[PDB]
Amino acid sequence: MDIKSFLYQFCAKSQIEPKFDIRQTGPKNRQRFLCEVRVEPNTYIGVGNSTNKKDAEKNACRDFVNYLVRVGKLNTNDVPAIHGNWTIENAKERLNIYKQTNNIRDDYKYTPVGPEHARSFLAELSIYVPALNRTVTARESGSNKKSASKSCALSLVRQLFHLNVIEP
Amino acid sequence: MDIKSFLYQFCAKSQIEPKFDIRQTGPKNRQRFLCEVRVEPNTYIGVGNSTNKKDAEKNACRDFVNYLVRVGKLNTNDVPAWTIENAKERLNIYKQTNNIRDDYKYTPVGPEHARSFLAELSIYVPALNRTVTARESGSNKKSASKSCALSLVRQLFHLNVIEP
RNA sequence: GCUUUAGAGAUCGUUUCGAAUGAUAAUCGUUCGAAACGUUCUCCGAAGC
């Protein structure tokens, strides 16, 4: 496992998160990063250095884990190393149900938009409705595939609502 | 360019760095994120918030930058809305004379979560009229490039076209 | 301009953990966090030519 994943997983129990602070300190060409981390209820602050902040974060993390090992809060063995009230929060989950219920094994096709450093997507899906002998389809943009797939599913649920194939 | 990179690229102009402080707010059925941001020496605190961290910091930046324009440090139009180390360096100038505009052709192989890249490049050298080629791989395109570039160069230091 | 090297920020993919919304397995998904391996762009200290 990863040390920083592990500490977040230790706090996740208590609905809190580790609170990191960080400050750079060196010559601007061999610069060094100083990192501290707190977690409530504890007063102790775990510190770590490195030439980059990702690593400084983890050295700090392992030192906070050392402290909870050292004050016996952890054992050494557990440690490693509204169109009918359908919208974006609700449409994708809803269309999923429809998809499962009518064994519509097809899935969203994505196409990339824009450059790699500013990538977005289109999500495309078509559902055939044998009852009405008729296909609804959508191609909607989104900042990522997940986002795109929901606005796609939103377009599809709305059209299917407007055909009394779906409730609200 | 996004609002927070902007704030950083405006701070690099002084070798100073923004400083963020993030905190959660609401309970399990409705939890939110509060982000505060400071740029020394300015006393101003930028404040943003939202359902997720990234958007909470972008809001905190946008607020801070909105401050900097009000106080005259920025202007609204400025804001948005033979080895692998020397192998590459030596090959690019061998390529530089012969106006060879051909570049590395990369090919991603393996699972997306553990890529490897094939790098290929061929040079129709005219000294002999063999056309020399390299096909090497790395776990990222720069590594693949260098190993590719290195194969090439070693295949000419051994055919006496490159002083070692 | 090219190379080597210490960095920073953004972008997206795939993968993987965690937190949250009678039962066994299977399968698709929603919100938040964290990690792995990578792509792309911008910023940038130093060194060589």
Author numbering:
A (entry chain A): 1 to 81, 161 to 247
B (entry chain B): 1 to 81, 165 to 247
Q: What is the paper's account of this structure, in its own sentences?
A:
Maleless (MLE) helicase plays an essential role to incorporate the roX lncRNA into the dosage compensation complex (MSL-DCC), and such function is essentially dependent on its dsRNA-binding domains (dsRBDs). Dosage compensation in Drosophila is achieved by a ribonucleoprotein complex MSL-DCC. MLE also contains auxiliary domains, including two tandem dsRBDs at the N-terminus and a helicase-associated 2 (HA2) domain, an OB-fold domain and a glycine-rich region at its C-terminus.
Only individual dsRBDs, consisting of residues 1–80 of dsRBD1 and residues 165–247 of dsRBD2, were visible in the electron density map. The linker region connecting the two domains is not visible, which is consistent with the hypothesis that this linker is normally disordered. In the crystal structure of the complex, part of the R2H1 loop structure (C135-U140) without protein protection was hydrolyzed, which is thought to stabilize the structure for better crystallization. Similar to all other members of the dsRBD family, MLE dsRBD1 and dsRBD2 share a conserved α1-β1-β2-β3-α2 core motif, in which the α1and α2 helices lie on a face of the three-stranded anti-parallel β sheets. Regions 1 and 2 are inserted in two successive RNA minor grooves and region 3 contacts the intervening RNA major groove. On the other hand, the residues in regions 1 and 2 of both MLE dsRBD1 and dsRBD2 form sequence-specific hydrogen bonds with the bases in the minor groove of R2H1.
